[PDB]
Design a binder for this molecule. Structure first.
Ligand SMILES: *[C@@H]1O[C@H](CO)[C@@H](O[C@@H]2O[C@H](CO)[C@@H](O[C@@H]3O[C@H](CO)[C@@H](O)[C@H](O)[C@@H]3O)[C@H](O)[C@H]2NC(C)=O)[C@H](O)[C@H]1NC(C)=O
Ligand SMILES: Nc1ncnc2c1ncn2[C@@H]1O[C@H](COP(=O)(O)OP(=O)(O)OP(=O)(O)O)[C@@H](O)[C@H]1O
Ligand SMILES: *[C@@H]1O[C@H](CO)[C@@H](O[C@@H]2O[C@H](CO)[C@@H](O)[C@H](O)[C@H]2NC(C)=O)[C@H](O)[C@H]1NC(C)=O
Ligand SMILES: [Cl-]
Ligand SMILES: [Cl-]
Ligand SMILES: [Cu+2]
Ligand SMILES: [Cu+2]
Ligand SMILES: [Cu+2]
Ligand SMILES: [Cu+2]
Length: 534
């Protein structure tokens, strides 16, 4: 249908790379003598000239930019990130892909008001994967995400590095953070506020830039795809501009939770909100060509309901040079890793139904705000469980996120007989897309930390009104590991604290080296992540 946003100059601005986010300092952990990387992130308003010939867009972002700066963390280095609210509305930060303790996982009610800051303690012990950090605050997630509180967080393993995949952030390892927005005549953002069905957007962005180009060498690139959009699901394919309907093959090498067991040979990638897929594309056969990254129309080929616009079939262009600077020495092994799949269970699955109760998006007819009713499951830590995620509806689709766990997609049924399980769903994931009339069974090990945790739809419109609920990953009082201070997300010890702008800019009081050191050494003594130690 006709584009509503003004006419944009297609493929004329080059793809931005979020900078890598540098720690302020490191703090000796008294427990193990190791260095904890400490960072400061300032959430603040800024403007961006999106449309060269028009007004500015008002955004609010991690360190005054969208996407946020990219985190790059080796497995086994604990990080502490002080997320500092200097904006107009509260925040709650969720590290999506992290088995963070309940109080460091971005619980929607665990907010930071402006003039406050919260310290998040992350383990960084999981399998190498593309994580992303984003706002999760009660009822205001859609707008906080859309206005630009989302950035990448790369968990790296030297073992993954010995597979010799195309490498180097900004070089042959490219973040591909997709968003779908709408602009006014004056080129500001159209707000998602008061939207209750879906906010599709008619302007496609990669890393915050509408319809970019990148100049590439005719060799393999590692592409880290993330759908950071509010509501748009995609069917990605690449075509030579000479033949825009001819889909070029590529390999999926990883899903949400990290590497597949084997690359999945693919020509069409389904990706919905909050899904991460890592692709290797070989430009070597296309020396001298423009490859266009495109999106499947017909609401992702009849899997979705998304409205398509004049230009939502276009993502960005790759202008392929005649030659490499030096040889491409990277490969893609047939065997990437042994995926730590959960031990299969025969226990009867739980059922969660994603639908409507009048004007409200619900799970089992419950809204997240209905505190009484929203804790839908108690799972003993260690348990493997199958959840059957049900979309009975033809008029909505629901990418379901479970916090804490990595899961195996066991099965997909479709009431429009459209598809089953996809080859790139062969590994471990933390989001799975319920297309039209789709039921999906996932299997997860609810481990290793006890806590109250969220699960929900990642269509941020639906999440906010109000398709979210909670599970309790439970232990008996004799469990120890200080479980009593890490099970309740709203525990006083880990709550936001106020600060003054002058303290923050001068690196004094609470931001002295000394205070930051004392505060993080105190946190470390509680040993939040000990039970994972292997
Ligand atoms: C999520 O599940 C956890 C279990 O992992 C629940 O925490 C448990 O809460 C009960 C009471 O809330 C605690 O037992 C109590 O101990 C004191 C004596 O020291 C006494 O006042 C009570 O009679 C009772 O025996 C239990 O220790 C605690 N477990 C842990 C490990 O903290 C938690 O309540 C659940 N959250 C929700 C929202 O359901
Ligand atoms: N996006 C939406 N927002 C609100 N209501 C919707 C939406 N899409 C569909 N509905 C309504 O919700 C109900 C269920 O929609 P659904 O897609 O299941 O409809 P259907 O085609 O009639 O399927 P069935 O015959 O199995 O009910 C219907 O009353 C429909 O009109
Ligand atoms: C739970 O948290 C407490 C609070 O930090 C830990 O207590 C510390 O333990 C170390 C080593 O035993 C001592 O040297 C500290 O002086 C303790 N501080 C306090 C206030 O008690 C405790 O070890 C943690 N327990 C577990 C099981 O992880
Ligand atoms: Cl059930
Ligand atoms: Cl110990
Ligand atoms: Cu998320
Ligand atoms: Cu998450
Ligand atoms: Cu939904
Ligand atoms: Cu979430």
């Amino acid at each position: 249908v006709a584009q509503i946003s003004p006419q944009y100059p297609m493929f004329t601005v080059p793809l931005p790379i979020p900078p890598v986010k540098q720690p302020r300092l490191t703090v000796t952990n008294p427990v193990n003598g190791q260095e904890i990387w400490y960072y400061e992130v300032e959430i603040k308003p800024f403007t961006h000239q999106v449309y060269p010939d028009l007004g500015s867009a008002d955004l609010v972002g991690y360190d005054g930019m969208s996407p946020g700066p990219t985190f790059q963390v080796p497995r086994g280095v604990e990080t502490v990130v002080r997320f500092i609210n200097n904006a107009e509305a509260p925040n709650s930060v969720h590290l999506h892909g992290s088995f963070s303790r309940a109080a460091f996982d971005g619980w929607a009610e665990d907010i930071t008001e402006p003039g406050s800051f919260k310290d998040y303690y992350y383990p960084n012990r999981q399998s190498a994967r593309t994580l992303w950090y984003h706002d999760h605050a009660m009822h205001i997630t859609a707008e906080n995400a859309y206005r630009g509180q989302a950035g990448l967080y790369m968990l790296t393993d030297p073992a993954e590095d010995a597979l010799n995949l195309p490498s180097g952030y900004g070089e042959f390892d490219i973040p591909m953070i997709l968003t779908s927005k709408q602009y006014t005549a004056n080129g500001n953002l159209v707000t998602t506020n008061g939207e209750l069905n879906s906010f599709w957007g008619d302007v496609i962005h990669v890393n915050g830039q509408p319809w970019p180009f990148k100049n590439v060498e005719p060799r393999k690139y590692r592409f880290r795809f993330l759908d950071a959009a509010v509501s748009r699901s995609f069917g990605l394919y690449f075509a030579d501009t000479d033949a825009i309907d001819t889909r070029l093959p590529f390999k999926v090498i990883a899903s949400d939770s990290g590497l597949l067991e084997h690359p999945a040979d693919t020509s069409l990638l389904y990706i919905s909100m909050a899904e991460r897929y890592e692709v290797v594309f070989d430009f070597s056969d296309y020396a001298g060509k423009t490859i266009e990254l495109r999106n499947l129309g017909g609401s992702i080929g009849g899997i979705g309901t998304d409205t398509d616009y004049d230009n939502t079939d276009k993502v960005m262009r790759f202008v392929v040079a005649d030659d490499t600077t030096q040889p491409d020495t990277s490969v893609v092994p047939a065997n990437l890793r042994d995926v730590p799949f959960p031990s299969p269970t025969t226990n009867t699955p739980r059922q969660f139904r994603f639908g409507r109760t009048g004007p409200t998006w619900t799970i089992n007819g419950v809204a997240f705000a209905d505190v009484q009713n929203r804790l839908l499951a108690n799972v003993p830590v260690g348990t493997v469980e199958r959840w059957e995620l049900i979309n009975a509806g033809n008029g909505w689709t629901h990418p379901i996120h479970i916090h804490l766990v990595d899961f195996k997609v066991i099965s997909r049924t479709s009431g429009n007989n459209a598809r089953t399980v996809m080859p790139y769903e062969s590994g471990l994931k933390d989001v799975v897309w319920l297309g039209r009339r789709e039921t999906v069974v996932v299997e997860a090990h609810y481990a290793p930390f006890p806590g109250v945790y969220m699960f929900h739809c990642h269509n941020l419109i639906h999440e906010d009104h109000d398709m979210m609920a909670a599970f309790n990953a439970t232990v008996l009082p004799d469990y120890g590991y200080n479980a009593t201070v890490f099970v309740d997300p709203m525990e006083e010890l880990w709550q936001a604290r106020p600060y003054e702008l002058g303290e923050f800019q001068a690196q004094s009081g609470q931001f002295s080296v000394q205070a930051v050191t004392e505060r993080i050494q105190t946190m470390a003594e509680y040993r939040p992540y000990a039970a994972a130690d292997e």
